[PDB]
């Protein structure tokens, strides 16, 4: 038994029109998220946290621009594939915690469904998955409504 | 024995006049912190880290706007209550680490008293509580003196 | 056996001309990093994460402005000294994960050499050291090319 820590961080800019996808959940909003991907900043930060704990340790690094298959690419696919590769190295899940940093939209109603998705994608109990949100009280690029940031931490177990 | 990780992040804007309260400590400063609460960004980030490790996992989520009891609400009360609920789920403390992000005021002289407070409120040794500060070298909303940010991580143990 | 968590965060502003030093690696770039030090924001964030896990828990706190010895001070020296002191308290390394937040320059080619340096300086295997990079998609002070930020987490073991 041995435990390993990981940390992830991601940002996307608002652009065009909604909805956005956060933690796998389609959330109504006036603006959309600019990206190659989903624009799922929650699942990107989480993915990086998991890869970092297993020392693998980018999504850039274990997917270099394939591009495409990949416009509106499903970030849940990225998450599950990253997870397969982490498990092949012998790791199992301790727990994850995710912090969405956004002035808006309101994340709280969608968090239980985010957790369902993440727990499915990682093959764990929901009690191993926490998600929260915070505003930056109108400060910074998140505060001015210019984009959304997310942080994530992960704990991994190896037999 | 099982260990669990949590992460917290908070921001408050400066507004009106001092002092501010950070980690429970009254710190002299030209501006105050705008909020419902203390405006304790250190103890809010910590509280979220502890709740996230126990998967509980917002302060919004286990206190929805009561509001009030709550103008100038004591963030130490929030911390202790969050802690009671975490312990009722069977968790004990591993350790916590807190990073205050502020251009000013200087946090270093007040850190030992912050640690006394936090350790009391969590019923642990002081060696289980670390607090630090950093500036952003005049960059961003913290750098321009517009507000204060804080990050926190926590490790939890379950029997 | 007991595990301990730490978190670090650092920022430096661009100023004058390159190169910069990140994770010990000299990276060509049009601007340099303003500081007393290296300006190594990666190794500063890491150092703080390690000190925070051992509750020690600033680089300000266990080096107050000596200043100098210290213009263009080698951040790897700071890292190794912080590490000596952490080991003297009885801690050994679990693992570390580092997240460089920069719009530019590109970090990916230099990451393997960063890991060599960090692993040498901490006397561990390279599999215990992860480093990644992310942009903020043109948002915030990192996005406008005004500076570089870095986050780090660390897991410590005590016999
Ligand atoms: C599996 N499938 C189908 C996929 C689903 C969803 C997304 C996929 C993607 S992706 O393009 O959406 N990957 C997430 C997008 O990366 P990001 O939001 O983190 O952007 P960023 O530019 O920050 O990162 C790109 C890479 O550049 C590198 N980088 C970043 C900054 C910097 N200063 N230096 C760097 O080297 C680093 O390795 C980083 O991973 C790629 C491949 C398969 C995907
Ligand atoms: C126990 N007592 C008495 C208390 C003491 C101190 C503070 C208390 C408080 S509080 O109001 O000070 N809670 C901390 C303030 O929250 P915050 O500084 O994190 O503000 P923010 O707006 O970021 O968070 C509010 C909630 O909105 C949610 N949110 C945030 C952003 C977003 N995009 N979506 C969301 O759903 C999320 O759940 C978050 O917890 C409430 C109840 C009892 C308190
Ligand atoms: C060992 N050798 C030789 C060394 C090598 C490389 C760097 C060294 C350095 S250093 O100057 O480069 N230390 C890193 C620079 O600190 P920083 O980039 O974190 O700057 P910042 O201003 O954020 O931090 C300074 C200190 O002020 C304190 N602080 C910060 C903000 C705030 N609001 N209050 C505070 O008290 C806190 O303790 C913090 O450590 C000092 C001594 C020996 C060094
Ligand atoms: C604590 C962390 C993770 C900080 C880095 C996040 C970031 C890119 C902030 C940028 O500036 P800002 O948005 O804070 O201020 P501004 O955009 O107004 O200059
Ligand atoms: Zn992304
Ligand atoms: Zn708050
Ligand atoms: Zn620094």
Coordinates of C-alpha atoms and ligand atoms in Angstrom, one line a residue:
Chain A
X1 CA 0.0 0.0 0.0
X2 CA 1.3 3.4 -1.1
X3 CA -0.6 6.7 -1.7
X4 CA 0.1 9.3 -4.4
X5 CA -1.0 12.9 -4.8
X6 CA -1.9 14.9 -8.0
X7 CA -3.0 18.4 -8.9
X8 CA -4.7 19.8 -12.0
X9 CA -5.6 23.2 -13.2
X10 CA -7.5 24.4 -16.2
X11 CA -9.1 27.6 -17.8
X12 CA -11.4 28.3 -20.7
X13 CA -12.6 31.6 -22.2
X14 CA -16.3 32.3 -22.8
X15 CA -17.1 32.7 -26.5
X16 CA -20.1 32.3 -28.7
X17 CA -23.2 31.1 -27.0
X18 CA -24.3 28.4 -24.6
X19 CA -24.7 26.0 -23.3
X20 CA -21.5 25.0 -21.6
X21 CA -20.4 21.5 -20.5
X22 CA -19.0 21.2 -16.9
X23 CA -18.3 17.9 -15.2
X24 CA -20.1 16.2 -18.1
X25 CA -23.3 18.2 -17.5
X26 CA -24.9 20.5 -20.1
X27 CA -25.6 23.8 -18.2
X28 CA -27.7 26.5 -19.8
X29 CA -25.8 29.8 -20.1
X30 CA -25.8 32.9 -22.3
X31 CA -22.2 32.3 -23.5
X32 CA -20.4 29.1 -24.5
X33 CA -16.9 27.8 -23.9
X34 CA -14.2 28.3 -26.6
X35 CA -12.2 25.2 -27.2
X36 CA -11.1 22.2 -29.3
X37 CA -12.8 20.1 -26.8
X38 CA -15.9 20.0 -24.7
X39 CA -14.4 23.0 -23.1
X40 CA -14.9 20.9 -20.0
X41 CA -12.5 22.7 -17.6
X42 CA -13.7 20.6 -14.7
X43 CA -12.9 17.3 -16.3
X44 CA -9.6 18.6 -17.8
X45 CA -8.4 19.7 -14.4
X46 CA -9.4 16.4 -12.9
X47 CA -7.8 14.4 -15.7
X48 CA -4.5 16.3 -15.1
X49 CA -4.7 15.6 -11.4
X50 CA -5.1 11.9 -12.0
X51 CA -2.3 11.8 -14.6
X52 CA -0.1 13.9 -12.3
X53 CA -0.6 11.5 -9.4
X54 CA 0.4 8.6 -11.6
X55 CA 3.3 10.7 -13.1
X56 CA 2.1 10.5 -16.7
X57 CA 1.5 13.6 -16.3
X58 CA -0.1 15.7 -19.0
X59 CA -3.1 15.5 -21.3
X60 CA -0.9 17.2 -23.8
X61 CA 1.7 14.6 -23.1
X62 CA -0.5 11.5 -23.6
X63 CA -2.5 13.2 -26.3
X64 CA -0.4 15.4 -28.4
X65 CA -2.7 17.1 -31.0
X66 CA -4.2 14.1 -32.6
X67 CA -6.3 16.8 -33.8
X68 CA -8.9 15.9 -34.8
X69 CA -10.7 13.4 -34.1
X70 CA -11.4 16.3 -32.2
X71 CA -13.7 19.2 -32.4
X72 CA -16.3 19.2 -29.7
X73 CA -14.4 16.2 -28.4
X74 CA -16.1 14.5 -25.4
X75 CA -13.9 15.2 -22.3
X76 CA -15.5 12.2 -20.6
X77 CA -13.7 10.0 -23.3
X78 CA -10.4 11.7 -22.4
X79 CA -11.1 11.1 -18.7
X80 CA -11.9 7.3 -19.2
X81 CA -8.9 6.7 -21.5
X82 CA -6.6 8.5 -19.1
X83 CA -8.1 6.3 -16.4
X84 CA -7.5 3.1 -18.3
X85 CA -3.8 4.0 -18.7
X86 CA -3.6 4.9 -15.0
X87 CA -5.1 1.6 -14.0
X88 CA -2.7 -0.3 -16.3
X89 CA 0.1 1.1 -14.2
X90 CA -1.5 -0.6 -11.2
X91 CA -3.2 2.4 -9.5
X92 CA -6.6 2.4 -8.0
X93 CA -8.7 5.4 -6.7
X94 CA -8.4 6.9 -3.3
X95 CA -10.6 10.0 -3.8
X96 CA -10.8 13.2 -5.9
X97 CA -11.9 16.8 -5.1
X98 CA -12.7 19.4 -7.6
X99 CA -13.1 23.2 -7.3
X100 CA -14.9 25.1 -10.1
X101 CA -14.0 28.8 -10.1
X102 CA -16.8 30.8 -11.9
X103 CA -18.8 33.9 -11.3
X104 CA -21.6 32.3 -13.2
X105 CA -23.6 30.2 -14.0
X106 CA -24.6 28.6 -10.7
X107 CA -23.0 25.2 -10.4
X108 CA -24.7 23.9 -7.2
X109 CA -27.8 22.4 -8.9
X110 CA -25.7 20.4 -11.3
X111 CA -23.1 19.0 -8.9
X112 CA -24.9 15.8 -8.0
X113 CA -25.1 14.9 -11.7
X114 CA -21.4 15.8 -12.2
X115 CA -20.5 13.4 -9.5
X116 CA -22.6 10.6 -11.1
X117 CA -20.7 11.1 -14.3
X118 CA -17.2 11.2 -12.7
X119 CA -17.9 8.2 -10.5
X120 CA -19.1 6.2 -13.5
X121 CA -16.1 7.2 -15.6
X122 CA -13.7 6.2 -12.8
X123 CA -15.6 3.1 -11.7
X124 CA -15.9 4.2 -8.1
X125 CA -18.4 5.1 -5.4
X126 CA -19.8 8.6 -5.4
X127 CA -18.4 9.1 -1.9
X128 CA -15.0 9.1 -3.5
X129 CA -15.9 12.1 -5.6
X130 CA -16.4 15.7 -4.4
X131 CA -17.1 18.7 -6.5
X132 CA -17.6 22.3 -5.4
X133 CA -17.8 25.8 -6.8
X134 CA -16.7 29.3 -5.7
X135 CA -16.8 32.8 -7.2
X136 CA -14.0 35.3 -7.1
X137 CA -16.4 38.1 -6.0
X138 CA -16.2 40.0 -9.3
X139 CA -12.4 40.0 -9.3
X140 CA -10.0 38.8 -12.1
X141 CA -10.9 37.3 -15.4
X142 CA -13.4 34.8 -13.8
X143 CA -15.0 37.7 -11.9
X144 CA -15.4 39.9 -15.0
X145 CA -17.2 36.9 -16.6
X146 CA -14.3 36.4 -19.2
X147 CA -13.9 32.7 -18.4
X148 CA -14.0 29.7 -16.0
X149 CA -11.2 28.1 -14.1
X150 CA -11.0 24.8 -12.2
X151 CA -8.7 23.1 -9.8
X152 CA -8.6 19.5 -8.8
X153 CA -6.7 17.2 -6.5
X154 CA -6.5 13.4 -6.6
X155 CA -5.3 10.7 -4.3
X156 CA -4.2 7.4 -5.8
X157 CA -3.5 4.0 -4.3
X158 CA -1.0 1.4 -5.5
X159 CA -0.9 -2.3 -4.4
Chain B
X1 CA -6.8 3.1 7.9
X2 CA -7.6 5.2 4.7
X3 CA -6.5 8.7 3.8
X4 CA -8.5 11.3 1.9
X5 CA -7.5 14.5 0.1
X6 CA -9.3 17.9 -0.1
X7 CA -8.8 21.2 -1.8
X8 CA -10.3 24.7 -1.1
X9 CA -10.1 28.1 -2.7
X10 CA -11.5 31.4 -1.8
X11 CA -11.4 35.1 -2.7
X12 CA -12.7 38.4 -1.1
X13 CA -12.6 41.9 -2.4
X14 CA -11.2 44.9 -0.4
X15 CA -13.9 47.4 0.5
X16 CA -14.4 50.0 3.3
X17 CA -11.8 50.1 5.9
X18 CA -9.8 47.7 8.1
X19 CA -9.0 45.8 9.9
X20 CA -9.3 42.4 8.2
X21 CA -9.7 39.0 9.8
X22 CA -7.4 36.2 8.4
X23 CA -7.1 32.8 10.0
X24 CA -9.1 34.2 12.9
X25 CA -6.5 37.0 13.5
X26 CA -7.4 40.7 13.5
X27 CA -4.8 42.3 11.2
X28 CA -4.5 46.1 10.9
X29 CA -4.9 47.4 7.3
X30 CA -6.2 50.5 5.4
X31 CA -9.0 48.6 3.7
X32 CA -11.4 45.9 5.0
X33 CA -12.9 42.8 3.5
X34 CA -16.3 42.9 1.9
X35 CA -18.5 40.0 2.8
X36 CA -21.5 38.4 4.6
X37 CA -19.0 36.8 6.9
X38 CA -15.8 37.5 8.6
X39 CA -14.5 37.8 5.1
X40 CA -12.0 35.2 6.4
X41 CA -10.7 33.8 3.1
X42 CA -8.1 31.7 4.9
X43 CA -10.7 29.8 7.0
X44 CA -13.2 29.6 4.1
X45 CA -10.6 27.9 1.9
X46 CA -9.6 25.6 4.7
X47 CA -13.2 24.8 5.5
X48 CA -13.9 23.8 1.9
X49 CA -10.7 21.7 1.8
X50 CA -11.9 19.8 4.9
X51 CA -15.4 19.4 3.6
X52 CA -14.1 18.3 0.2
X53 CA -11.9 15.6 1.7
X54 CA -15.0 14.2 3.5
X55 CA -17.1 14.7 0.4
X56 CA -19.6 17.0 2.0
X57 CA -18.4 19.2 0.0
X58 CA -19.4 22.8 0.1
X59 CA -20.0 25.5 2.7
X60 CA -22.7 26.7 0.4
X61 CA -23.9 23.1 0.5
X62 CA -24.1 22.6 4.2
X63 CA -25.0 26.1 4.8
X64 CA -27.3 27.5 2.2
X65 CA -28.0 31.1 3.0
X66 CA -29.4 30.8 6.5
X67 CA -28.8 34.4 6.1
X68 CA -28.6 35.7 8.7
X69 CA -27.7 34.8 11.6
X70 CA -25.1 36.2 9.6
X71 CA -23.6 39.6 9.1
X72 CA -20.0 39.7 10.3
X73 CA -20.5 36.0 11.0
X74 CA -17.5 34.3 12.8
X75 CA -15.8 32.0 10.2
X76 CA -14.3 30.1 13.2
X77 CA -17.8 29.0 14.1
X78 CA -18.3 27.8 10.5
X79 CA -15.0 26.0 10.7
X80 CA -15.9 24.2 14.1
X81 CA -19.3 23.2 12.9
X82 CA -18.0 21.9 9.6
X83 CA -15.5 20.0 11.7
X84 CA -18.1 18.5 14.0
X85 CA -20.0 17.1 11.0
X86 CA -16.7 15.7 9.4
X87 CA -15.9 13.9 12.7
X88 CA -19.5 12.5 12.9
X89 CA -18.7 10.7 9.6
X90 CA -15.7 9.1 11.3
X91 CA -12.8 11.2 10.0
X92 CA -9.9 12.4 12.1
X93 CA -7.2 14.9 11.0
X94 CA -4.0 14.1 9.1
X95 CA -2.8 17.6 8.4
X96 CA -3.7 20.9 6.7
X97 CA -1.7 23.4 4.7
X98 CA -2.9 26.9 3.8
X99 CA -1.5 29.4 1.2
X100 CA -2.6 33.0 1.6
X101 CA -2.3 35.0 -1.7
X102 CA -2.0 38.7 -0.9
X103 CA 0.2 41.6 -2.0
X104 CA -0.5 43.2 1.5
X105 CA -0.7 43.3 4.4
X106 CA 2.2 41.3 5.6
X107 CA 0.9 37.9 7.0
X108 CA 4.1 36.4 8.5
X109 CA 3.9 38.1 12.0
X110 CA 0.3 36.7 12.4
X111 CA 0.8 33.2 11.2
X112 CA 1.7 31.6 14.6
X113 CA -1.5 33.0 16.1
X114 CA -3.5 31.8 13.0
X115 CA -2.1 28.3 13.7
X116 CA -3.1 28.5 17.4
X117 CA -6.7 29.3 16.3
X118 CA -6.9 26.6 13.6
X119 CA -5.4 23.9 15.9
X120 CA -7.8 24.8 18.7
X121 CA -10.8 24.7 16.3
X122 CA -9.8 21.3 14.9
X123 CA -8.6 19.9 18.2
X124 CA -5.2 18.9 16.9
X125 CA -1.5 19.7 17.5
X126 CA 0.0 22.8 15.9
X127 CA 2.4 20.5 14.0
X128 CA -0.6 19.4 12.0
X129 CA -1.3 23.0 10.8
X130 CA 0.8 24.9 8.3
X131 CA 0.0 28.4 7.0
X132 CA 2.0 30.5 4.5
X133 CA 1.7 33.6 2.4
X134 CA 2.8 34.7 -1.0
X135 CA 2.5 37.8 -3.2
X136 CA 1.8 37.8 -6.9
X137 CA 4.5 40.4 -7.5
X138 CA 2.0 43.2 -8.4
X139 CA 0.2 41.1 -11.0
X140 CA -3.5 40.2 -11.2
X141 CA -6.3 41.4 -8.9
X142 CA -4.3 40.4 -5.8
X143 CA -1.3 42.3 -7.2
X144 CA -3.3 45.5 -7.8
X145 CA -4.5 45.3 -4.2
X146 CA -8.1 44.6 -5.3
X147 CA -8.5 41.6 -3.0
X148 CA -7.1 38.5 -1.3
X149 CA -7.1 34.9 -2.4
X150 CA -6.4 31.7 -0.4
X151 CA -5.8 28.1 -1.2
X152 CA -5.8 25.2 1.2
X153 CA -5.3 21.4 1.1
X154 CA -6.3 18.9 3.8
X155 CA -5.5 15.2 4.5
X156 CA -8.1 13.2 6.4
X157 CA -7.9 9.8 8.1
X158 CA -10.7 7.3 8.6
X159 CA -10.7 4.3 10.9
Chain C
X1 CA 3.8 5.2 8.7
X2 CA 2.0 8.5 8.3
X3 CA 1.4 10.7 5.3
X4 CA 1.4 14.4 5.0
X5 CA 0.2 16.9 2.4
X6 CA 1.6 20.2 1.2
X7 CA 0.7 22.9 -1.2
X8 CA 2.8 25.7 -2.8
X9 CA 2.0 28.6 -5.1
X10 CA 4.3 31.2 -6.7
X11 CA 4.3 34.0 -9.3
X12 CA 6.9 36.1 -11.1
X13 CA 6.6 39.0 -13.5
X14 CA 8.3 39.1 -16.9
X15 CA 10.9 41.9 -17.1
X16 CA 14.1 42.5 -19.1
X17 CA 15.1 39.8 -21.4
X18 CA 15.6 36.0 -21.4
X19 CA 16.2 33.4 -20.9
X20 CA 14.1 32.2 -17.9
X21 CA 14.9 29.4 -15.5
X22 CA 12.0 27.0 -14.8
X23 CA 12.5 23.7 -12.8
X24 CA 16.2 24.3 -13.0
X25 CA 16.1 24.4 -16.9
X26 CA 17.4 27.4 -18.9
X27 CA 14.6 28.1 -21.4
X28 CA 15.0 30.6 -24.3
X29 CA 12.5 33.4 -24.3
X30 CA 12.1 37.1 -25.4
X31 CA 11.6 38.3 -21.8
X32 CA 13.3 37.3 -18.5
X33 CA 11.9 36.8 -15.0
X34 CA 12.2 39.6 -12.5
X35 CA 13.4 38.6 -9.1
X36 CA 15.9 38.3 -6.3
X37 CA 16.4 34.7 -7.2
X38 CA 16.5 32.5 -10.2
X39 CA 13.0 33.6 -10.6
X40 CA 12.3 29.9 -10.6
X41 CA 8.6 29.9 -9.9
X42 CA 8.3 26.1 -10.4
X43 CA 11.0 25.3 -7.7
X44 CA 9.7 28.0 -5.4
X45 CA 6.1 26.6 -5.5
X46 CA 7.6 23.1 -5.0
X47 CA 9.8 24.2 -2.1
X48 CA 6.8 25.8 -0.4
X49 CA 4.7 22.6 -0.9
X50 CA 7.5 20.5 0.7
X51 CA 7.9 22.9 3.6
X52 CA 4.1 23.1 4.1
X53 CA 3.8 19.3 4.3
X54 CA 6.5 19.3 7.0
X55 CA 4.9 22.3 8.6
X56 CA 8.0 24.5 8.4
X57 CA 6.3 26.2 6.3
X58 CA 7.6 29.2 4.4
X59 CA 10.7 29.9 2.4
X60 CA 10.3 33.4 3.8
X61 CA 10.1 31.7 7.2
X62 CA 13.3 29.6 6.9
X63 CA 15.0 32.2 4.9
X64 CA 14.2 35.7 6.0
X65 CA 16.0 38.1 3.7
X66 CA 19.6 36.9 4.2
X67 CA 19.8 39.1 1.2
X68 CA 22.2 38.6 -0.3
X69 CA 24.1 36.1 -0.8
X70 CA 21.4 36.5 -3.1
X71 CA 21.0 38.1 -6.5
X72 CA 20.4 35.5 -9.2
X73 CA 20.4 33.0 -6.3
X74 CA 20.1 29.4 -7.5
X75 CA 16.6 28.1 -6.5
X76 CA 18.0 24.5 -6.7
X77 CA 20.2 25.4 -3.6
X78 CA 17.1 26.7 -1.8
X79 CA 15.3 23.4 -2.8
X80 CA 18.1 21.1 -1.5
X81 CA 18.6 23.1 1.8
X82 CA 14.8 23.0 2.4
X83 CA 15.0 19.3 1.7
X84 CA 17.9 18.7 4.1
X85 CA 15.9 20.4 6.9
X86 CA 12.7 18.4 6.0
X87 CA 14.7 15.1 6.2
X88 CA 16.2 16.1 9.6
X89 CA 12.7 16.1 10.9
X90 CA 12.3 12.5 9.8
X91 CA 10.3 12.9 6.6
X92 CA 10.9 10.9 3.4
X93 CA 9.4 11.6 0.0
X94 CA 6.1 10.2 -1.2
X95 CA 5.7 12.1 -4.5
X96 CA 5.3 15.6 -5.9
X97 CA 3.3 17.1 -8.7
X98 CA 3.9 20.5 -10.2
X99 CA 1.6 22.7 -12.5
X100 CA 3.3 25.5 -14.4
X101 CA 0.8 28.2 -15.5
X102 CA 2.1 30.1 -18.5
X103 CA 0.9 31.3 -21.9
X104 CA 4.4 30.9 -23.2
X105 CA 7.1 29.7 -23.6
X106 CA 6.3 26.1 -24.4
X107 CA 7.2 24.0 -21.3
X108 CA 6.7 20.5 -22.7
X109 CA 10.1 20.0 -24.3
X110 CA 11.9 20.9 -21.1
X111 CA 9.8 18.9 -18.6
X112 CA 12.0 15.7 -18.7
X113 CA 15.1 17.7 -17.8
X114 CA 13.1 19.5 -15.1
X115 CA 12.2 16.1 -13.6
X116 CA 15.9 15.0 -13.7
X117 CA 16.9 18.1 -11.7
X118 CA 14.1 17.8 -9.2
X119 CA 14.7 14.1 -8.7
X120 CA 18.4 14.6 -8.2
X121 CA 17.8 17.5 -5.7
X122 CA 15.3 15.4 -3.7
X123 CA 17.3 12.1 -4.0
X124 CA 14.3 10.2 -5.4
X125 CA 13.3 8.2 -8.5
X126 CA 11.9 10.2 -11.4
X127 CA 8.6 8.3 -11.1
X128 CA 8.1 10.3 -7.9
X129 CA 8.2 13.6 -9.8
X130 CA 5.5 14.9 -12.1
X131 CA 5.6 18.3 -13.9
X132 CA 3.0 19.7 -16.2
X133 CA 2.0 23.0 -17.9
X134 CA -1.2 24.7 -18.8
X135 CA -2.2 28.1 -20.5
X136 CA -5.0 30.3 -19.3
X137 CA -6.2 30.8 -22.9
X138 CA -5.1 34.4 -23.1
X139 CA -6.9 35.3 -19.8
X140 CA -5.6 37.0 -16.7
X141 CA -2.0 38.2 -16.1
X142 CA -0.6 34.9 -17.3
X143 CA -2.7 35.1 -20.4
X144 CA -1.7 38.7 -21.3
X145 CA 2.0 37.5 -21.0
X146 CA 2.6 39.6 -17.9
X147 CA 4.1 36.7 -15.8
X148 CA 4.2 33.0 -14.9
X149 CA 2.4 31.2 -12.1
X150 CA 3.0 27.8 -10.6
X151 CA 1.2 25.4 -8.3
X152 CA 2.6 22.4 -6.6
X153 CA 1.5 19.6 -4.2
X154 CA 3.6 17.2 -2.2
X155 CA 3.1 14.0 -0.2
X156 CA 5.5 13.3 2.6
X157 CA 6.1 10.1 4.6
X158 CA 7.2 9.8 8.2
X159 CA 8.5 6.7 9.9
Ligands
LIG1 C1 -9.8 11.4 -26.0 N1 -10.5 12.3 -26.6 C2 -11.2 12.0 -27.7 C3 -10.4 13.6 -26.2 C4 -11.5 14.2 -25.5 C5 -11.5 15.5 -25.1 C6 -10.3 16.3 -25.3 C7 -9.2 15.8 -26.0 C8 -8.1 16.6 -26.3 S1 -8.0 18.2 -25.8 O1 -7.4 19.0 -26.9 O2 -9.3 18.7 -25.4 N2 -7.0 18.3 -24.5 C9 -7.4 19.3 -23.5 C10 -7.0 20.7 -24.0 O3 -5.9 21.2 -23.4 P1 -5.9 22.4 -22.4 O4 -7.3 22.8 -22.3 O5 -5.2 22.1 -21.1 O6 -5.1 23.6 -23.2 P2 -3.6 24.0 -22.9 O7 -3.1 24.8 -24.1 O8 -3.5 24.7 -21.6 O9 -2.7 22.7 -22.8 C11 -2.1 22.1 -24.0 C12 -0.8 21.4 -23.7 O10 0.3 22.3 -24.0 C13 1.4 22.1 -23.0 N3 1.8 23.4 -22.6 C14 0.9 24.4 -22.1 C15 1.4 25.6 -21.7 C16 2.8 25.9 -21.8 N4 3.3 27.0 -21.4 N5 3.6 24.9 -22.3 C17 3.2 23.7 -22.7 O11 4.0 22.9 -23.1 C18 0.8 21.2 -21.9 O12 1.3 19.9 -22.1 C19 -0.7 21.2 -22.2 O13 -1.2 19.9 -21.9 C20 -7.0 16.0 -27.0 C21 -7.0 14.7 -27.4 C22 -8.2 13.9 -27.2 C23 -9.3 14.4 -26.5
LIG2 C1 -21.7 29.0 11.0 N1 -21.7 30.3 10.8 C2 -22.3 31.0 11.7 C3 -21.1 30.9 9.8 C4 -19.9 31.6 10.0 C5 -19.2 32.2 8.9 C6 -19.8 32.2 7.7 C7 -21.0 31.5 7.4 C8 -21.6 31.5 6.1 S1 -20.9 32.3 4.8 O1 -21.9 33.0 4.0 O2 -19.8 33.3 5.2 N2 -20.2 31.1 3.8 C9 -18.9 31.6 3.2 C10 -19.2 32.5 2.0 O3 -19.1 31.8 0.8 P1 -18.0 32.2 -0.3 O4 -17.1 33.3 0.4 O5 -17.3 31.0 -0.8 O6 -18.8 32.9 -1.5 P2 -19.2 32.2 -2.9 O7 -20.2 33.0 -3.6 O8 -17.9 31.9 -3.7 O9 -19.8 30.8 -2.5 C11 -21.2 30.6 -2.3 C12 -21.7 29.3 -2.7 O10 -22.3 29.4 -4.1 C13 -22.1 28.2 -4.8 N3 -21.6 28.6 -6.1 C14 -20.5 29.5 -6.3 C15 -20.2 29.8 -7.6 C16 -20.8 29.2 -8.7 N4 -20.5 29.5 -9.9 N5 -21.9 28.3 -8.5 C17 -22.2 28.0 -7.2 O11 -23.2 27.2 -7.1 C18 -21.1 27.3 -3.9 O12 -21.8 26.3 -3.3 C19 -20.6 28.3 -2.9 O13 -20.4 27.6 -1.6 C20 -22.8 30.9 5.9 C21 -23.5 30.3 7.0 C22 -22.9 30.3 8.3 C23 -21.7 30.9 8.5
LIG3 C1 19.4 29.1 -0.5 N1 19.5 30.1 -1.4 C2 20.8 30.5 -1.7 C3 18.5 30.6 -2.1 C4 18.3 30.3 -3.4 C5 17.2 30.8 -4.1 C6 16.4 31.8 -3.5 C7 16.6 32.2 -2.1 C8 15.8 33.1 -1.5 S1 14.5 33.9 -2.3 O1 14.5 35.3 -2.0 O2 14.5 33.7 -3.8 N2 13.0 33.2 -1.7 C9 12.0 33.1 -2.8 C10 11.4 34.5 -3.1 O3 10.1 34.6 -2.4 P1 8.8 34.6 -3.3 O4 9.1 34.5 -4.7 O5 7.8 33.7 -2.7 O6 8.3 36.2 -3.0 P2 7.1 36.6 -2.0 O7 7.2 38.1 -1.7 O8 5.8 36.1 -2.5 O9 7.4 35.9 -0.6 C11 8.2 36.5 0.4 C12 7.8 36.1 1.8 O10 7.0 37.1 2.3 C13 6.0 36.5 3.2 N3 4.7 37.2 2.9 C14 4.2 37.3 1.5 C15 3.0 37.9 1.3 C16 2.3 38.5 2.4 N4 1.1 39.1 2.2 N5 2.8 38.4 3.6 C17 3.9 37.8 3.9 O11 4.3 37.7 5.0 C18 6.0 35.0 3.0 O12 6.7 34.4 4.1 C19 6.9 34.9 1.8 O13 7.7 33.7 1.9 C20 16.0 33.5 -0.2 C21 17.1 33.0 0.5 C22 17.9 32.0 -0.1 C23 17.7 31.6 -1.4
LIG4 C1 -4.6 31.5 -7.4 C2 -4.3 31.2 -8.9 C3 -4.6 29.8 -9.4 C4 -3.9 32.2 -9.7 C5 -3.7 32.2 -11.1 C6 -5.0 32.4 -11.9 C7 -4.8 33.5 -12.9 C8 -4.4 33.2 -14.3 C9 -5.0 34.8 -12.5 C10 -4.9 35.9 -13.4 O1 -5.1 37.2 -13.1 P1 -6.5 37.5 -12.3 O2 -7.6 37.0 -13.0 O3 -6.3 37.1 -10.9 O4 -6.5 39.1 -12.3 P2 -6.6 40.0 -13.7 O5 -7.2 39.1 -14.9 O6 -7.8 41.0 -13.4 O7 -5.3 40.7 -14.0
LIG5 ZN1 -9.1 22.5 -21.1
LIG6 ZN1 -15.4 33.5 1.6
LIG7 ZN1 9.4 33.0 -6.3

